[PDB]
Design a protein around this ligand. Structure first.
Ligand code: HEM
Ligand SMILES: [Cl-]
Length: 398
């Protein structure tokens, strides 16, 4: 049900969008969100759904608000306890600098070929089967195995770790949110404590032995960081790869272009990131503030969908059209401002390696005949399942 309209909010700005259940979902997730960009919809609206909150609908406002952390705070970033997601500068800067030591560009460059080897061996074991559940069989195992590589963690721990992180996004009832969180932390603590004593060159060891505002990081702070490094690179990557593969399976022309022109693959990656953008975070007002002619009130929540900037016709012409040759690909898929994704370099490499290894070994594939692909909408929008099929005689072992 809807929350009653706060008196400071004018009726002409009220559009009852439900971010967890948009009405045109069956047409696809990005299409469903783009209803907010129809010409009768203002740049900034209020929805009475999910407790009541603002939505900025255009790239210009989304970028501005993400820049202005003094008015738009990350203390409450979700509608309706990881570090540094809930911090503003100044305190955020220290924790962000440390996490960048574990996923930064120099780390991605060294792990580059480990990343390719993991992709090749996952794809090679599927290739002869002529079918797969892509989300289940590749999109999940690939980033979780990269995390295990990054964090120096043994391979037998994958099923249990996959289970705990599935709870935070898709609970089965076994345990509450905080219970999945604590199970995750209980897993993490001993490994953190020991790598203080004999570190490796792994991510847990670096975060465990970190210094923050002059003094050593606490076990509490370390555990809450490692947690975000795990869950931060899962949900987004799993669901983004699914969107990308869904599109390519439905578009033989786009497959052929990348097969014939493998050098376009990094550009193609950027264009898929724009077209199948998937995050919608928010901020909370620190004070009363007039924003583009609209009176915002201290404590108001505002949804700032990273998804919508690149879909905005004011940023990219014919924004639903996938064109790998756009001279200017404009998006905020990895965010904007001081929280801009620390994993953005790792994510791009994961996407690029996936496109190259898959198109090289399984160049021709389709959606399983009969199947209708179902989507979900949220803070991270996604694909529920992606059944794919191909003819093993048309593949290559490499
Ligand atoms: C397609 C893949 C990805 C997408 C679309 C994505 C998107 C985003 C966005 C929009 C934010 C900022 C959220 C906000 O301002 O509230 C963010 C932050 C973050 N991401 Fe990603 N991300 C991706 C992959 C990854 C990967 C692979 C990692 C590695 C573990 C990662 C780690 C992080 C971390 C640690 C932050 C927090 C930055 C901070 O608070 O200072 N991300 N991501
Ligand atoms: Cl699947």
């Amino acid at each position: 049900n809807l929350a009653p309209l706060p008196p400071h909010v004018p009726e002409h700005l009220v559009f009852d969008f439900d971010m967890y259940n948009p009405s045109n979902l069956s047409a696809g997730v990005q299409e469903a969100w783009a209803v907010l960009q129809e010409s009768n919809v203002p740049d900034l609206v209020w929805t009475r759904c999910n407790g009541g909150h603002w939505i900025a609908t255009r790239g210009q406002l989304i970028r501005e608000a993400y820049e202005d952390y003094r008015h738009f705070s990350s203390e409450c970033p979700f509608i309706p306890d990881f570090i540094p997601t809930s911090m503003d500068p100044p305190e955020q800067r220290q924790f962000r600098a440390l996490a960048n030591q574990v996923v930064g560009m120099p780390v991605v460059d060294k792990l580059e070929n480990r990343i390719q080897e993991l992709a090749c061996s996952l794809i090679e074991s599927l290739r002869p089967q002529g079918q797969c559940n892509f989300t289940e069989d590749y999109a999940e195992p690939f980033p979780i195995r990269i995390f295990m590589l990054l964090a120096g963690l043994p391979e037998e721990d994958i099923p249990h770790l996959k289970y705990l992180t599935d709870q935070m996004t898709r609970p089965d009832g076994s345990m509450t949110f905080a219970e999945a969180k604590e199970a995750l932390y209980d897993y993490l603590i001993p490994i953190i404590e020991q790598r203080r004593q004999k570190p490796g060159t792994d991510a847990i060891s670096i975060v465990a032995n970190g210094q923050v505002n002059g003094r050593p990081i606490t076990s509490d702070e370390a555990k809450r960081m490692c947690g975000l490094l795990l869950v931060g690179g899962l949900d987004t990557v799993v669901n983004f790869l699914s969107f990308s593969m869904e599109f390519l399976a439905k578009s033989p022309e786009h497959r052929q272009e990348l097969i014939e022109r493998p050098e376009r693959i990094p550009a193609a990656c950027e264009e898929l990131l724009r077209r199948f953008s998937l995050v919608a975070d928010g901020r909370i007002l620190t004070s009363d503030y007039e924003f583009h002619g609209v009176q915002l009130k201290k404590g108001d929540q505002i949804l700032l969908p990273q998804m919508l900037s690149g879909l905005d016709e004011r940023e990219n012409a014919a924004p639903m059209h996938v064109d790998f040759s756009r001279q200017k690909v404009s998006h905020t898929t990895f965010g904007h401002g001081s929280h801009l994704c620390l994993g953005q370099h790792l994510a791009r490499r994961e996407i690029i390696v996936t496109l190259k290894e898959w198109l090289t070994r399984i160049p021709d594939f389709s959606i399983a005949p009969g199947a209708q692909i179902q989507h979900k909408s949220g803070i991270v929008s996604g694909v529920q399942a992606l059944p794919l099929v191909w003819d093993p005689a048309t593949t290559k072992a490499v």
